[PDB]
From a paper:
Abortive infection (Abi) is a bacterial antiphage defense strategy involving suicide of the infected cell. Some Abi pathways involve polymerases that are related to reverse transcriptases. They are unique in the way they combine the ability to synthesize DNA in a template-independent manner with protein priming.
We also obtained crystals of Ll-[name] that diffracted X-rays to 3.1 Å resolution. The polypeptide chain was first traced into the cryo-EM maps, and the resulting model was used to solve the crystal structure by molecular replacement. In the crystal structure of Ll-[name], eight to ten nucleotides of the DNA chain could be defined for individual protomers. In all subunits, the DNA’s 5′ end is covalently attached to the hydroxyl group of Tyr44, which for the first time demonstrates that this tyrosine serves to prime DNA synthesis in Ll-[name]. Tyr44 is located in the middle of a long loop (residues 21–57) that essentially lacks secondary structure elements. In the crystallographic data a continuous electron density for the entire DNA chain is only observed in one of the subunits of the hexamer. For the other protomers, the electron density contains a gap after the second nucleotide.
Author numbering:
A (entry chain A): 0 to 188, 191 to 599
B (entry chain C): 150 to 188, 190 to 299
C (entry chain E): 0 to 188, 192 to 599
D (entry chain D): 300 to 449
The structure:
DNA sequence: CCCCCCCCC
DNA sequence: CCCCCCCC
DNA sequence: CCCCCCCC
DNA sequence: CCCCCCCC
């Protein structure tokens, strides 16, 4: 029944290996049988809107976890205050949203706690009746099903009321969590479940309390419980509504029903320091607006056949992209995100010949220079949140017959033509800390083997402060892929960065508790694998006259010296086990060549 | 499509009554140069002007529209406009008097407008300020004929 | 010079006795001579917009400070975390603001620190160039002078960019105060700012979300924060004018605007500040100016004392409508000008004392219209006008308006609108619009309104979700009625004290918890024996309370409560105040809880 | 009818304040579509002085007082106003040329304008280079003319 | 104290 | 030169 | 000419 | 995995 199939989903999700194999990057699997014991690093089962699975994933760390028990490292209390990877992405054309990717250690510390107390989450979730985000887009709980749950919650409503909470994730006071779960008066009196959660959550953001570290499934799960206690307080007051995260739909029929619900709603926000986004408060009167019909979109290619001209397919695809971008302008939320899936599905459904698919996306018209793949590429450069979608779209038409080389050339030519504008855009993303925008360009260059855009001086200028770890890793990979460039200059800019950021901390702080922990692990891993010639390391170390001991060179570059520095080594000893067992957090590639297409 | 690449926004710019208010004596200016024109006959530019005015009783207000010769002369004029703008590292798409300027920073839209207005004042061209508009991504497009066809 | 007048302002403000006598309730005095050694019981020298001076003031505590030195009592470490008075006021008809009135002990600890390190405030203040809010509306630094400063900052500007920070005080992340004063990266590693943060948190029970807003100390702390925001923008060759969180950036080219916005956002993103995108506008020249009061101040330029009293009634009544409509159009603060210019016009036009009584206490037999009843009714449409209305009444009282006639007029209002007022009272309770409640209760105690709430309705005010101030007023209302038995009131107060202590570690001292003001008010009265000690021992024997060396072992007995906590630094502070007969609430001239002349 | 209530008896500060308040009133009036309101600033300030018969030394101090607290000067505000529309170049200069004959010391007029140029030297040069590049002829003429006049 | 009166959080 | 003042 | 059709 | 594709 309903109670049965609910618990199947939750007994599945609440598993430490699942919450890092798919939770760290907020990935989602449709079927349980996709949780293979193999690494399965090449192909994608699940999807995510965040980071490229091929270059950044946990499949190596996951395969370690089902062969080794790591809870030993976390069984103690008093967790370590680690610094996350601050990664800032856009919200509109003129607004932003701040992700924080927590240090893997303090993440697993929080992960194991949530699982050791799965009951305090699950039994509240299954009893809850208003939330359509408590499924986390997981398993068979797709968009049509969350929509269908909302429809039954809005019966009897001549009108609908909308409320959105303003910057809910990033303005959340962490100490509000014991208030919502246990009661504000009960928390004023220590060492409970809510209190221990609060201290583990802040451990992932260097003990700061303004906001939650958003960007992973754990934050999603913790956020859903906080709002499910909201839902429970409103159920006591005999209210009924639908809710997806911070977005409410209250159905009513008389103005007083609305004002009653509005007042009891404000009392809960006042009590828990939540701010109602007033620009988004709206009452919909029947006949009800609904500007989200995808029927016209999904039926765009109805009258096209495999027998249609390759030029016909080119024009219709290009036509279709413009139709959806216009539909998003009219308020059809998600219409642009649908461009990639339906082009993929339509080619498959119409069974276009694999040779004919190459021509469609390879054809550069010598009359107008139009290549439809170039158009899709340029589209994706208009919202860096489309990065994974464009890359999996290429992945799909690639395995359909689009020449990996043809695609690499088209992308190369696009960068060549827009060289001036992209350089200008990079300097902007660097000065104003637009991470994902810089990430997208760097990820495109490493993936499509682009080498003409930046020189070595312009590449080393990327290895600097106020750059996310993901961009640094990508920029490092770009430097290494040119064999002509000498590693000596790269080691200076990297070591200079490592010393500079370690200086801001207390001198007794372990380096794996600091910033740049992911880029640090990436470097130490490549160094232990000796991608950096141990000789070419000693050459640099002697240009700075670095003292030496039995650990090796006393440099931030040497992991063996770093592995011991600091009073609390629980983090260093954590990432130590990972380096020894050659667990990677960044994927070298199929041939370990840092090439990512076939 | 390929001209508008890299643009998170696109600026629209339409000249006002371009065909009917076009000063014929500005045609030599665009092809050769306003300064050079002061120096003054027998040139290709100046003779083209005289063959044009001769079609409309030696009047210089506007070009006689309705035929293809006027379209061709209008393109040549407007292409020397394009070259002056190309020289200044600007990129856009124009159909006759209708410009589409893709950009990403308001600094660019300003740089572009400043030089655009400079050529317009030099050659007695008028911007139709009613049709000036920027489109922010996601871009509107109402020109679709898919459901019609 | 310009810095000559600043240094004199700040050497005066940054004095701990001034910062509580005029800063706790955010008062303002126009002359340094107004800081008299005497307790100004009947002189409202200062101006405030928060709490009625005649009832809630620090003049007695200020008097104790001039004699004793409490810097000795406060020197130490790890300050005690106290719970403030949560007092919620409106922002507009549909919005609210959250004032937090800090425990006196925690407040004074912050006050002494700021003064011992006034150097770190004053040095940044004098050096500042962009802030017109850094004068805190004191001395000869009036609105016209601040506008004159802004005008010279907007020269060379064809356009003005307007930028407002969203919910600034309440959303201000406290730990970001070290970030702005000494840098964020350096803060990863217990200096000046690192301790100012922990003194601030201890005023709001170690909450790090928001600043205790409603007093001068928080305005100065907020000012340092933004004055460092200013130094960062000054290093980038930017010029603008700022008042608290509202910026005006003059510019000419769209280059300069986007240049300014990009840096502005970086500073904001770094310190968890949020920009109110709705109040973001650009004014092109010719510039709008919807805030000119020239027509308001010259409203009475045509009327004289020779004119009929009925004409004065009409022009005043038509003047109130002119200003309320001008506030509608955007002339910000126009309603706040109604009371001053009426008072200043009456004085300047030299209106006789007997005429003022008749102008303001006349009842039209035809229309039942009384102009003072109108002004009162206006004051109840925005509870942030309570102090304005009472100081206005205080002024026409001294000019002739009979205290008796005024009390009768308000009494009549409350009788006509018993239905509505009792609806609004029970509304403000259920939604913690606790200022709107404080106003009604304050009008009742001041104007002697004994016919609105019965005994039961008053007792039902002594509950939770009621702020200390309205609690004190509701208790006063009960006491002002002799026929109400003091026994029932105790049972509501004892139950209330008992219920809020249950929310704490049993080792927590009561004077560190919530309701610290109401507790002090009650304890002071019991020590003064206002609560008949025979009538106290009667109630305790009813509850079968045990009796010990200090007393009857209840929340009501201060001698027992005095020392029942792990950290008694708070109780020991308030105990000294009770012993020396320092009052935080004025019992009145004859201690009859009456406040009219 | 803006200055009708004020007379010679009022303090120079009052006069300075009221004139400063008056410039804002007309500027806002022009913003509302009151065509010509800004061009009326200069005559009615001149003519109000005549009708009210303010003493010569008061004219100097009104237009020379640098308020020690705010460092505000009402003549400097008038000057900054004229640099917002080049077509006010003559109506500002006749205004000075008028109050110069009313008792305003030219040595102070020159000193006040020179301070403005010293203060906004970066901005003014930035604006000059922008006028040459875009062939804005009157805007440049204004700055150059103020330089030679003052 | 010796005319004024208004911005915010 | 003998009160004013502003439209294009 | 050999499943298109529309912009100033 | 066995006519789907989209919300924060
Ligand atoms: Mg939101
Ligand atoms: Mg046209
Ligand atoms: Mg604000
Ligand atoms: Mg504000
Ligand atoms: Mg046209």
């Amino acid at each position: 029944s309903m109670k049965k199939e609910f618990t199947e989903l939750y007994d599945f999700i609440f598993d430490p290996i699942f919450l890092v194999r798919y939770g760290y990057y907020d990935r989602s699997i449709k079927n349980k049988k996709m949780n293979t014991a193999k690494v399965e690093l090449d192909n994608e089962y699940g999807k995510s809107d965040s980071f490229y699975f091929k270059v950044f994933n946990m499949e190596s760390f996951a395969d370690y976890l089902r062969s080794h028990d790591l809870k030993t490292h976390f069984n103690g209390k008093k967790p370590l205050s680690t610094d996350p990877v601050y990664f800032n992405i856009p919200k509109n054309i003129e607004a932003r949203r701040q992700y924080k990717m927590p240090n893997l250690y303090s993440y697993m510390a929080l992960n194991y706690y949530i699982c050791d107390n799965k009951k305090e989450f699950i039994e509240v979730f299954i009893d809850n009746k208003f939330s359509t985000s408590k499924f986390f887009n997981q398993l068979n709980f797709d968009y049509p099903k969350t929509q269908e749950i909302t429809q039954t919650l809005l019966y009897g409503g001549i009108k609908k009321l909308h409320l959105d909470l303003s910057n809910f994730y990033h303005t959340l006071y962490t100490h509000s969590i014991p208030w919502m779960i246990d009661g504000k008066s009960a928390s004023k009196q220590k060492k409970g479940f809510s209190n221990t959660l609060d201290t583990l959550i802040t451990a992932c953001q260097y003990d700061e309390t303004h906001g939650i570290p958003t960007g992973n499934l754990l934050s999603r799960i913790i956020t859903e419980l906080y709002m499910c206690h909201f839902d429970k307080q409103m159920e006591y007051k005999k209210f009924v509504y639908s809710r997806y995260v911070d977005d409410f739909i209250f159905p009513f029929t008389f103005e007083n029903e609305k004002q009653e619900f509005l007042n009891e709603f404000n009392l809960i926000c006042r009590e828990n320091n939540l701010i109602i986004n007033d620009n988004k408060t709206k009452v919909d009167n029947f006949p009800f607006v609904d500007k989200s019909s995808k029927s016209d979109i999904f039926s765009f290619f109805e009258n096209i056949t495999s027998t249609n001209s390759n030029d016909k397919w080119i024009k219709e695809i290009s036509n279709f992209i413009d139709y959806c971008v216009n539909e998003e302008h009219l308020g059809n939320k998600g219409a642009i995100k649908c461009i990639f899936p339906v082009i993929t599905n339509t080619l498959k459904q119409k069974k276009v010949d694999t040779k004919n698919i190459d021509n469609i996306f390879s054809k550069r018209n010598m009359v107008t220079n139009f290549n439809v793949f170039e158009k899709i590429l340029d589209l994706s450069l208009k919202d860096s949140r489309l990065t994974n979608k464009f890359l999996t779209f290429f992945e799909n038409i690639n395995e359909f017959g689009f020449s990996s080389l043809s695609a690499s050339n088209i992308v190369k030519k696009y960068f060549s033509n827009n060289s001036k504008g992209l350089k200008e855009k990079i300097d902007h993303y660097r000065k104003n800390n637009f991470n994902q925008e810089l990430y997208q360009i760097l990820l495109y260059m490493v993936v499509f083997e682009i080498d003409d855009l930046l020189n070595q001086e312009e590449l080393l200028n990327l290895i600097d402060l106020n750059i996310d770890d993901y961009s640094l890793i990508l920029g490092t990979i770009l430097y290494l892929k040119n064999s002509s460039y000498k590693l000596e200059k790269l080691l200076k800019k990297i070591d200079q960065l490592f010393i500079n950021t370690h200086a801001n901390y207390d001198v007794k702080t372990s380096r794996m508790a600091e910033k740049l922990w992911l880029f640090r692990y990436f470097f130490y891993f490549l160094n232990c694998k000796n991608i950096f010639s141990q000789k070419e390391i000693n050459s640099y170390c002697q240009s700075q006259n670095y003292n030496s001991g039995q650990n090796g060179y006393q440099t931030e570059l040497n992991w063996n010296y770093i592995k011991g520095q600091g009073k609390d080594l629980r983090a260093n000893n954590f990432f130590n086990e990972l380096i020894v067992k050659e667990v990677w957090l960044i994927s070298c590639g199929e041939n370990e060549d840092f090439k990512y297409l076939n | 499509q390929t001209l508008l690449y890299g643009g998170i926004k696109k600026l629209h710019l339409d000249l006002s009554n371009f065909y009917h208010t076009l000063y014929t004596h500005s045609i030599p200016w665009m092809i050769d140069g306003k300064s050079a024109s002061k120096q003054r006959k027998k040139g290709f530019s100046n003779t083209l002007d005289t063959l044009i005015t001769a079609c409309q009783y030696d009047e210089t207000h506007g070009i006689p529209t309705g035929n293809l010769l006027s379209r061709i002369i209008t393109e040549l004029y407007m292409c020397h406009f394009d070259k002056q703008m190309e020289y200044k590292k600007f990129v856009y798409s124009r159909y006759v008097d209708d410009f589409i300027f893709p950009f990403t920073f308001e600094n660019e839209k300003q740089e572009f407008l400043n030089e655009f207005n400079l050529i317009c004042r030099e050659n007695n061209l008028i911007i139709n300020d009613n049709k000036t508009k920027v489109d922010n991504f996601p871009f509107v497009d109402k020109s679709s004929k898919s459901d019609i066809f």
